[PDB]
Amino acid sequence: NSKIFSPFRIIGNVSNGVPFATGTLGSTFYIVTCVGKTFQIYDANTLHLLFVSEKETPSSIVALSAHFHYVYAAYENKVGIYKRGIEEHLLELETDANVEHLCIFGDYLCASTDDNSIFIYKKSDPQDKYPSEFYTKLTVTEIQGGEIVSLQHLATYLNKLTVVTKSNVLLFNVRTGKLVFTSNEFPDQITTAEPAPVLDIIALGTVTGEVIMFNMRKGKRIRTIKIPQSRISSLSFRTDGSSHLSVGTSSGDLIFYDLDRRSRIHVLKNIHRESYGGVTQATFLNGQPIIVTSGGDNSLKEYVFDPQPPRYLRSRGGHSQPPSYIAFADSQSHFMLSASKDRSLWSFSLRKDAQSQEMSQRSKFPEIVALAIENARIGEWENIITAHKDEKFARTWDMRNKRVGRWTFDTTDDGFVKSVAMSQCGNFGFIGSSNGSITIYNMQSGILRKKYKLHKRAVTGISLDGMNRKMVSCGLDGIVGFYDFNKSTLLGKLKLDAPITAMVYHRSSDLFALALDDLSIVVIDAVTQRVVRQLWGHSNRITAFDFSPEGRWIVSASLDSTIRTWDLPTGGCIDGIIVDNVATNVKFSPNGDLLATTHVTGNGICIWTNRAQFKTVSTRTIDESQKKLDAEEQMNKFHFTKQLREGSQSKDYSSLLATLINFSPAAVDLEIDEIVWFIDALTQGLKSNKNFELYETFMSLLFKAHGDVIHANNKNQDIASALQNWEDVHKKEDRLDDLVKFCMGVAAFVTTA
Amino acid sequence: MKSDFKFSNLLGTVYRQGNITFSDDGKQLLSPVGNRVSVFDLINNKSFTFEYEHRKNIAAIDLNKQGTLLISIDEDGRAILVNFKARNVLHHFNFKEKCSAVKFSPDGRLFALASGRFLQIWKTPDVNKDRQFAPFVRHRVHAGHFQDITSLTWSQDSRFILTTSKDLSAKIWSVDSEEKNLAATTFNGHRDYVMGAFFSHDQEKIYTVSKDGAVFVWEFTKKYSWRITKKHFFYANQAKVKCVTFHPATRLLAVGFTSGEFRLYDLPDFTLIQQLSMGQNPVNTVSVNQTGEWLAFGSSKLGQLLVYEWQSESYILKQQGHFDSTNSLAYSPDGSRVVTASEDGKIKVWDITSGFCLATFEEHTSSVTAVQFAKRGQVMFSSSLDGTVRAWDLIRYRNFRTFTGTERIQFNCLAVDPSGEVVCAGSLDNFDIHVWSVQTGQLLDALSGHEGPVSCLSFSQENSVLASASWDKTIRIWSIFGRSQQVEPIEVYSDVLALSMRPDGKEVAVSTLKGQISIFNIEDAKQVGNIDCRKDISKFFTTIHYSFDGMAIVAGGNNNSICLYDVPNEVLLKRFIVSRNVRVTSVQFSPTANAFAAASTEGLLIYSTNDTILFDPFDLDVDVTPHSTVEALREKQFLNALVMAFRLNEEYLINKVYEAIPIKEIPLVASNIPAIYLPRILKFIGDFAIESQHIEFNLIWIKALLSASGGYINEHKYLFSTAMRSIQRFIVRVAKEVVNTTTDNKYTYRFLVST
Amino acid sequence: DTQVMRTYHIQNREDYHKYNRICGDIRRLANKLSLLPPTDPFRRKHEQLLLDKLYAMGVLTTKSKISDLENKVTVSAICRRRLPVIMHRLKMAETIQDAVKFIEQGHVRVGPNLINDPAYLVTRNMEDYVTWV
RNA sequence: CAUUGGUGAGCAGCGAAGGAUUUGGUGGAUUGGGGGAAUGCCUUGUUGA
């Protein structure tokens, strides 16, 4: 529907809170993490971006499952059987209830709903790829047990399903639908269950910190573990020979407990945010001492046991809160800097791996109001200036080392940092305080170099030309400050009707647009020191606006859900993009290809595609709520007879001229009376006011090959009648040479003079 | 300027080893090179795309049936997808390893990969966009084999697979699991290694060849089996089949060898049409026309970089050279023509703006160190290490003189006067510069004034002052046409290799003994000194040039980029060349002021000044609508229509508002235009003139505009000199074209009176 | 032989095998031109044409005679033409191995160019241009 | 006479309940000539079986 951009992809998503799946990849494993209406498939040992869902679901996926080479996605009444991200099959359950948990064993599919009804599916053949046929329906009445917590299956339990409830544990014979075992009423509500690699024993983690080692054959406890003040969220067992216990908590802590020696080994302290659920799923590797933890904080972590406390191995994560301010880190369109209000500092890759890395602050830094980035001085010194909320200093950063700088930048006027800027050469930083002072520092040595004070209110945007000559500024007292960078002279100032909130500057055209409080966009030519453009139509405040790299477009993002493309050669709005999740940041790529938009909801970054293969479009607003090759070809260094007889009776040589001008260098063709009608074609060709460049060729080849046939040794025959019809308009064609003598002679004179 | 500067063309067609393929149209030529990918046409050769994501040096390219799906394959073995204009719509990481064979389906539906020791079939999507993490979906796999697939043939049905591998077996696979003839029948019985297997399009004949030049044809019969059609036993060729291809006419074979020849064969007769040997350098790749009219073949990097087009009736259609690395460039007095200097000892002529190589000159005993013209155009010159320096003509084919007379093996630098009267040459190890006459070649006086070796020789447009840079921390000024010599200035730092001059005789730039670049006047007052060279993959200052507009300089070292500066202190741009393993050795500017030069091991030439980027010359949006106000100014007020038209920079507007107005209004508008709207349209009109066929049209424009302010543009030179060049080249090129046909049509009627 | 490799500290034995063939190219060429009658001006001129090249090549440092072509042409004359061998002679360096390591970590500048190749060959006349860093 | 080299003591300022210096492993990203025969060989002829 949009006339420039198309929704392209979202970068910055790892997890959402759904417990991950794990499956077999030959000998290693794969991990299925959820995004929402999308999921992601990763390596176990190396965590490479392997696969993704090729098509979005109608709603968010509730439960994830991983069979040997298959991924089973649970939503509204449908489960997608996928392989390698590709939809191989889709079951629709015969209900309107919502699917909660799944279980797969032998030849079975277990599909639990929120109405305590489970649909059991069976394979037609045991060598089939998947169950597809409705076998039976079981219903759990309230007199049989509580609400179903999970669906599990222990060792040696053929045709028997473990359905754990809030009140008791149920054991079914799914070949018959019979409940072969019911357990007693349990005092504590069960939140987490886990299969054991030992026979007939299931773990039952309660709502409080109690682990119930529960026998399934006899139906009794042997052991329970009392944890003071914890809600058990995830449980996993070390299956490399050592019998241990991991206890996920809602706090984000992970409790390492030893089973045989009866001791608490360790606890990981707040590796996931308790506000985002804490540890949603924690799973050891089968035969390896590596546990992988997930949370609702857009991250996943990995931990190893070095043969002992665990060791932090590697992790892949993003911002836990939706992004606030971003910047393209390179013109090669590979890296970016992203900063959100979760006090995190991430830097993203844009290639097929799409990897990420959080910047090193080496308890977080306060959240960020402004960014300043360049690409000329990576590795040589610091290249990032960050403006934090409620701080009187700025923080420098190195993109090369991914590590914080050595220089904090005090405003020296008792005011908070409100606008940061950098020079294109990467030498000087420009900061504008909340009191109005703008200091120039040296990015190599961190020194005070220069200080200005003209604004009496907070400085909201600072820039400089790429020639490092004229420095522009905008303040809340309506002031637009024009400085010389070489001197300290006030070159100019302009006063507007509204205070200015942001300054974005186009360097290679020396224009800068300004978001004002009067809902207008003031684009300014800097060399004139003149307000030149102003844009109207935005009903609400604009927070993000950026220049097209060719300087022709400005797409802006406003609070009234308007993302409008603005064409500068006409000064009007040519496109408006009306969304439901409004973009907090719109950022033009250095190449003319992509767009970086961060939104209100969603921790990832939607990238938008300008098609850029064509356009001539100009439609409007508000909607839904050669020439030398032939003459060079003339010299040689080493049918149509219908048409001449049709033109023999009439004026029909435009078609023959079309065949000659189409193809066929006709020195060989015109060799195979008729030449009189050819001269008739020459006069009709001279009748038009075009193609005389071909006419010169035709008359020339007429002289060359058949000039003896023209000669005929006794002239003034009927040939000289048609030639007499030729020379008189040849004299009309003799005018053109003196014009060329004028042009070449005057150009030669001014060449001399 | 403020333009984007990049290569939409290059220097040299094929410098590294690559494949070869035509288009489906037959009027386009796909000519790859080892590092990047460029697409050509038949007439008016232009570099179309630039696919560069390679870190290893090989490339494979083919289109499906309509030329919109284009790939390249390096040794890394991943896929890039561009439409027509190097967009990189899809960046599909395919593998870590390379691929031996790869082929589309002829219906454009399926896709064929041969790697490892297996077979991989992938989905071919239509004309679309990105948004795909994996746009390629597996259709089928076919397993197993014994080892890696060496060659591949398909079917017109797109359901049959006839292939061969290193295991001397021609295996068979069904595409859509149809099991065509229910078998995977391998064809064997070969005495030597099978180089090529090709399936005939009649569904009847089975073509096989082995490396001994023996051809075996088998039948489509699966008593009831595939029997023999024909056998061969050649033991007299003593060669190896390097490349083999089959014709769509299904009648001929074209065989390329390691021996440096190319042999023609007929399939039912098994006869030699003709063999063509041109040397010992082998033919690497070969491509066939889709109807088989023209015959082209690729060759190795160590062999020939020379690819020749051919026919079925044995005559060459297109020839090309491009031997080893470029040492220097030289701009023609019209600038459209480009000569090359190389290590071989040859100088080659290249109108590479249209791709053509007309001729060359070859009299050298050793390599060439520099090339330079004379602005008269009558003569160009050779600066080589041959022991002499010889003079040359354009199209008359005569070495005028070889200038020498002392024992010398190394002639490094050179300078001439603009009059062409005297030529001075700087000897490297000998501390003497030698003058030579245009009359006979006389050595009148010898100039022993040096204590270090010379490094640059540059003469001014003022034509009174010779500038020289030597390797002794001393800059040298000289006068010949007066009565004496001038006291040479003393530099502060820096033995100088690279020197640059203004064509006014006032501004002079020196490269220091490091990455600092300092410029100064004729009164030796230093204007700028530019900071050292960055960019680790130690300092270089090897080449420098003062731009012809007089507002910029271009700096070149050898750290794989190029640097841009203006007359004030600052950097204009820095353009880095992305390449894996010195780069720059000669920099000068174009006389038409559209690009500049760069001599390298690779060879890359143009800098692409563009107009699609929006500019604001004279506050454009005071003229509010760019269309309706113009449509108002096409009825009335033709003076303001052009003043409004210059403030815009949309060429789809410029041709129409420039076209619409009548003839009589043209001298009036030429009379009343301001002088600040002038140089860009007088610059643009010369490049715009060469394309269109409205010559009398622009002719009446440039007579009035040229007659309008001749004294002012005579007062405002160094810009209207360049625009003057850009129009004068069009003037003489059309002029010599139309005068000849004017006289050859003129004499006819008097000859009619004769006899 | 073996100690000549040890004294000159050559990286490869095949590098010794290269220059023996390069000497062997000269030596049979020294033979065939010597197998001529003495009255030939072709013979007398072209011996001098070969000698005058090899002076500036640095193989014949001093001025030599006709019979020294059979004599003075050795592999070791080529082995002295290497870069660190020349470097040790003019006494800006200190040992043989010290001349090696400065080319290794890059402290030698020959004229305007930086050179770090260990197999660099030095002529008789270009040797004035080796500068420090 | 030179806050001249080294050594050691003390004070101002800067921080305050620790600071400074070094090293190891693990994890990720990124890269041949000249002569020669009795004698061996090659090639050709020859002798009979």
Curated annotation (Swiss-Prot), chain A:
GO terms for biological process: maturation of SSU-rRNA; rRNA processing. The keyword Coiled coil does not apply. SMART domains: WD40. PROSITE patterns: WD_REPEATS_1, WD_REPEATS_2, WD_REPEATS_REGION. It comes from the Eukaryota. InterPro entries: Quinoprotein_ADH-like_sf (IPR011047), SSU_processome_Utp21 (IPR007319), WD40/YVTN_repeat-like_dom_sf (IPR015943), WD40_repeat_CS (IPR019775), WD40_repeat_dom_sf (IPR036322), WD40_rpt (IPR001680). Coiled coil: none annotated. It is found in: Nucleus, Nucleolus. GO terms for cellular component: 90S preribosome; nucleolus; nucleoplasm; nucleus; Pwp2p-containing subcomplex of 90S preribosome; small-subunit processome. Disulfide bonds: none annotated. Involved in nucleolar processing of pre-18S ribosomal RNA and ribosome assembly. Interacts with snoRNA U3. Interacts with MPP10. Interacts (via WD repeats) with UTP18. Component of the ribosomal small subunit (SSU) processome composed of at least 40 protein subunits and snoRNA U3. This is U3 small nucleolar RNA-associated protein 21. It comes from Saccharomyces cerevisiae (strain ATCC 204508 / S288c). The lineage of its organism: Eukaryota, Fungi, Dikarya, Ascomycota, Saccharomycotina. The gene is UTP21.
Curated annotation (Swiss-Prot), chain B:
Keywords: Nucleus, Phosphoprotein, Repeat, Ribonucleoprotein, Ribosome biogenesis, rRNA processing, WD repeat. One of its GO terms (molecular function) is mRNA binding. One of its GO terms (cellular component) is nucleolus. The keyword Repeat applies. WD repeats lie at residues 12-52, 53-93, 94-132, 144-183, 189-222, 236-275, 278-318, 321-360, 363-402, 406-448, 449-488, 491-530, 538-575, 582-617. Its main location: nucleus. The keyword Transport does not apply. One of its GO terms (biological process) is maturation of SSU-rRNA. It comes from the Eukaryota. It holds the Pfam family ANAPC4_WD40. Required for bud-site selection and cell separation. Also involved in nucleolar processing of pre-18S ribosomal RNA. Belongs to the WD repeat PWP2 family. Interacts with snoRNA U3. Interacts with MPP10. Component of the ribosomal small subunit (SSU) processome composed of at least 40 protein subunits and snoRNA U3. This is Periodic tryptophan protein 2.
UniProtKB/Swiss-Prot annotation, chain C:
One of its GO terms (biological process) is rRNA processing. It is found in: Nucleus, Nucleolus. Its main location: nucleus. Residues 81-133 form the S4 RNA-binding domain. GO terms for cellular component: 90S preribosome; Mpp10 complex; nucleolus; nucleoplasm; small-subunit processome. GO terms for molecular function: RNA folding chaperone; rRNA binding; snoRNA binding. Keywords: Nucleus, Ribonucleoprotein, Ribosome biogenesis, RNA-binding, rRNA processing, rRNA-binding. Belongs to the universal ribosomal protein uS4 family. Component of a heterotrimeric complex containing IMP3, IMP4 and MPP10. Interacts with MPP10. Component of the ribosomal small subunit (SSU) processome composed of at least 40 protein subunits and snoRNA U3. Required for the early cleavages at sites A0, A1 and A2 during 18S ribosomal pre-RNA processing. This is U3 small nucleolar ribonucleoprotein protein IMP3. The lineage of its organism: Eukaryota, Fungi, Dikarya, Ascomycota, Saccharomycotina. The gene is IMP3.
